[PDB]
Amino acid sequence: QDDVAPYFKTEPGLPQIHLEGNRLVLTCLAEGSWPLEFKWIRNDSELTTYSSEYKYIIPSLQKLDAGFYRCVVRNRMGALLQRKSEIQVAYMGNFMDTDQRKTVSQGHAALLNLLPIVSCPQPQVTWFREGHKIIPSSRIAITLENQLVILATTASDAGAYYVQAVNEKNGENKTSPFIHLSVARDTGTHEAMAPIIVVAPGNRSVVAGSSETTLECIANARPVEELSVHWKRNGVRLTSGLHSYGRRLTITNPTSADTGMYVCEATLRGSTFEPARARAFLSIIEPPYFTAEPESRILGEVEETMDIPCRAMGVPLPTLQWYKDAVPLSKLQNPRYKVLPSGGLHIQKLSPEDSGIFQCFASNEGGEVQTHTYLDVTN
Amino acid sequence: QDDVAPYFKTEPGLPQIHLEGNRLVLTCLAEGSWPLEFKWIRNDSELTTYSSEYKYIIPSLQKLDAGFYRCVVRNRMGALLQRKSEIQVAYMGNFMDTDQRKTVSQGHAALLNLLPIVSCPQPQVTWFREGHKIIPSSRIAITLENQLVILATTASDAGAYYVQAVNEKNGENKTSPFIHLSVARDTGTHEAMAPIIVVAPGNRSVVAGSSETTLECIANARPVEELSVHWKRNGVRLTSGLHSYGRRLTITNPTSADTGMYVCEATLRGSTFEPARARAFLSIIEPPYFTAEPESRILGEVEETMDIPCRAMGVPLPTLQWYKDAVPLSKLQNPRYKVLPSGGLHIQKLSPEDSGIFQCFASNEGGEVQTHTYLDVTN
Ligand SMILES: *[C@@H]1O[C@H](CO)[C@@H](O[C@@H]2O[C@H](CO)[C@@H](O[C@@H]3O[C@H](CO)[C@@H](O)[C@H](O)[C@@H]3O)[C@H](O)[C@H]2NC(C)=O)[C@H](O)[C@H]1NC(C)=O
Ligand SMILES: *[C@@H]1O[C@H](CO)[C@@H](O[C@@H]2O[C@H](CO)[C@@H](O[C@@H]3O[C@H](CO)[C@@H](O)[C@H](O)[C@@H]3O)[C@H](O)[C@H]2NC(C)=O)[C@H](O)[C@H]1NC(C)=O
Ligand SMILES: *[C@@H]1O[C@H](CO)[C@@H](O[C@@H]2O[C@H](CO)[C@@H](O)[C@H](O)[C@H]2NC(C)=O)[C@H](O)[C@H]1NC(C)=O
Ligand SMILES: *[C@@H]1O[C@H](CO)[C@@H](O[C@@H]2O[C@H](CO)[C@@H](O)[C@H](O)[C@H]2NC(C)=O)[C@H](O)[C@H]1NC(C)=O
Ligand SMILES: *[C@@H]1O[C@H](CO)[C@@H](O)[C@H](O)[C@H]1NC(C)=O
Ligand SMILES: *[C@@H]1O[C@H](CO)[C@@H](O)[C@H](O)[C@H]1NC(C)=O
Ligand SMILES: [Zn+2]
Ligand SMILES: [Zn+2]
Ligand SMILES: [Zn+2]
Ligand SMILES: [Zn+2]
Ligand SMILES: [Zn+2]
Ligand SMILES: [Zn+2]
Ligand SMILES: [Zn+2]
Ligand SMILES: [Zn+2]
Ligand SMILES: [Zn+2]
Ligand SMILES: [Zn+2]
Ligand SMILES: [Zn+2]
Ligand SMILES: [Zn+2]
């Protein structure tokens, strides 16, 4: 009857990373009764006013333009809110031009942290010692956080260390100042060192159906050539997915059967030392999906009870928030509406102002899904 | 021992769609014994020669630059091949400036196909009839392929139809030529038309863990207001996920429990007609993941048997192809190597030339995963 509330024809997709200086165009393509008006919101902050323009163009991207973008479509029926889309910008700043110093006792592991640098994403790092490149070996490792771990340091390891960082999205490179490493002699007890875990695998959670995830576990011992790092699950040692001298375990395409505890066990062959063990817990997060959605339109007699269902499942439990014509009920401050723990919304006393778009957003760490309905209040 | 075969520090990610004229930078970030050399391959065609440059820059993107890109890293040990990354370019051409004509009998459904236009992705379409916008109603639908379906056509539906197409990535719009629709009178049997499915839901397969998928089923009958389209599974009618007058069923976050048959059933209320039914089969494709990978390095005595394992799982079964220093064994034409159905590779007689990188690519419709190993041939 030419009284159709807006709805989106396009599903905003996955996060996209774009280079600086590039032209970016965002579209708010909806379907409903004409004329329609569109406005844009970035980080819960309005960018544009309502107009007939359905696209937002950034001729040259900047670091500030990055954020979560939304668009609001509105007509005589009400206003509808789009699912947020993450717009990331590729940028790489400089290091702070101040050299650092660090001293480590001989035989103990030395961890050199990548000097602070702002970059999205974090650049890949190539470590050097006075021009000579450092390759990961049995006693040298590079963490997922670009930390240089030198197991069983010696007097030959003293020197100025630096990196060449490269951003994998825009290709820019930056050279870091020096970390002057000094190795101090400790008295020669260090002939056989018990295996001790230096970088332990922390708790990790990943999205369902994702490509792969990688846990890291680095240990130190002497002699380092006899050091063996293994991975166990349910008390059973693993074989597939290992990388980088057994220090990285990659679980590819994890499901609900891959959740639980993974144990890192570092042993020293030919020795009676107790193996050093660490715990790591892998969790699978499920994106929210509705098991009950409100019908597209619902009639309502003035001052009569009304329940608007909205139930969603997924791990962890999705958190739900409502909107009335693209306005949160938390900021709407109306005692007429009352949120329901089971999922829906309860409105006991109606009013001619209650007519409009009601939108239920279910969100967790795995993203968000939204449903909506138009409340028609009879005369 | 400073003899490390190359391996990639970066995991090439999901397909990315970029606008025309934008600057694109691709990086081949690997780790191994220096110096390393890099070259780029697009659509199994070499773009650059071997050099010390690790990035490939397109200052201004074009429609021709779209394709699957790979990079090859090489040193004294051998050559390694990167997983392909899909580079899509946003472009929108024009329609062929020639109007079309179509005649449909009165009371029968009329399908108007979107006129041919080259665009990536396919644009969202807004249908018009001589300036007046056409909104989907109980007798008017728009398919996923942007087809205009007019159920129970009448004499008032005759006229020139056209569209305004908008590319959702770059925002460009194009206006289509006219489809002159003529409605021809057929003798008045058309008072109660049995429900007949016009657009049936075909077979559909989607990736595991994907956001959502949508099946479409459109039917025609008279009177159209009494037409009801429902969805059944296991003989049980569905309630959630329905859209567009019950013509679209959206299965969000499908798993192995959502595969099987979905039935579309269109009924005419208040009538004794037989419901029109259609079959649609939803399949879940699992990306390939290795259950057995070859160790990073393997020793080999000259002219001795050798088996290199490489087993992967996923639905449908992954297809495996091998490479020797980034060169396919199919094009290598060596009877020494022989592929194994169980998964691996069998080399019975060795040779000093057999030393190098061997790479096993497991690929299906859900993507590809690769493993590699260095064959060291003893003197
Ligand atoms: C718009 O909102 C986004 C999201 O809040 C802002 O991105 C934030 O930017 C900060 C730094 O500016 C980043 O912090 C990063 O997150 C980790 C979380 O563990 C933090 O520990 C690190 O320091 C890391 O740098 C991150 O991208 C993000 N922070 C959060 C909490 O989301 C963005 O800056 C906002 N832009 C505008 C223009 O408002
Ligand atoms: C590099 O290779 C890609 C992949 O083969 C090429 O993309 C191809 O481009 C065609 C049209 O140029 C497209 O065809 C499309 O696929 C469906 C498949 O059902 C087809 O029926 C439609 O006609 C649709 O247009 C598609 O993007 C793709 N085709 C295939 C089979 O992959 C690309 O053009 C190549 N570029 C260069 C520079 O070599
Ligand atoms: C790191 O980036 C700089 C640019 O910021 C590169 O320096 C360029 O080198 C090329 C030839 O090698 C010159 O034509 C350019 O003029 C240089 N740019 C500037 C701003 O001077 C440098 O080569 C990069 N390093 C690596 C290892 O790739
Ligand atoms: C479709 O795109 C054209 C451009 O190709 C738009 O025409 C522009 O309109 C603005 C103001 O409306 C002018 O400032 C530009 O000069 C126009 N461009 C050209 C090339 O003339 C047109 O507005 C778009 N249509 C819609 C509905 O957005
Ligand atoms: C990891 O999660 C487990 C779950 O019980 C918890 O016991 C442990 O303390 C967590 N560790 C960290 C470092 O958060
Ligand atoms: C869809 O798949 C089923 C599976 O058996 C098959 O029987 C049917 O013919 C297929 N239909 C089409 C249109 O491919
Ligand atoms: Zn880009
Ligand atoms: Zn200094
Ligand atoms: Zn120590
Ligand atoms: Zn000591
Ligand atoms: Zn909906
Ligand atoms: Zn009304
Ligand atoms: Zn782009
Ligand atoms: Zn004409
Ligand atoms: Zn018909
Ligand atoms: Zn007839
Ligand atoms: Zn590997
Ligand atoms: Zn050797």
UniProtKB/Swiss-Prot annotation, chains A, B:
Q: List the disulfide bonds.
A: 28-71, 217-264, 310-360
**What compartments host this protein?**
Cell membrane; Synapse
Superkingdom of origin: Eukaryota
Q: Which positions fall inside the Ig-like C2-type domain?
A: 6-88, 93-179, 195-283, 288-378
**Glycosylation positions in this chain:** 43, 173, 203
Tell me the tissue specificity: Expressed by non-overlapping subsets of retinal neurons. Sdk1 and Sdk2 are expressed in non-overlapping subsets of interneurons and retinal ganglion cells (RGCs) that form synapses in distinct inner plexiform layer (IPL) sublaminae (at protein level).
Role this protein plays: Adhesion molecule that promotes lamina-specific synaptic connections in the retina. Expressed in specific subsets of interneurons and retinal ganglion cells (RGCs) and promotes synaptic connectivity via homophilic interactions.
UniProt family annotation? Belongs to the sidekick family.
Assembly mode: Homodimer; mediates homophilic interactions to promote cell adhesion. Interacts (via PDZ-binding motif) with MAGI1, MAGI2, DLG2, DLG3 and DLG4.
Read off the domain note.
The PDZ-binding motif mediates interaction with PDZ domain-containing proteins MAGI1, MAGI2, DLG2, DLG3 and DLG4 and is required for is required for synaptic localization in photoreceptors.
Name it.
Answer: Protein sidekick-1
Organism source for this protein? Mus musculus (Mouse)
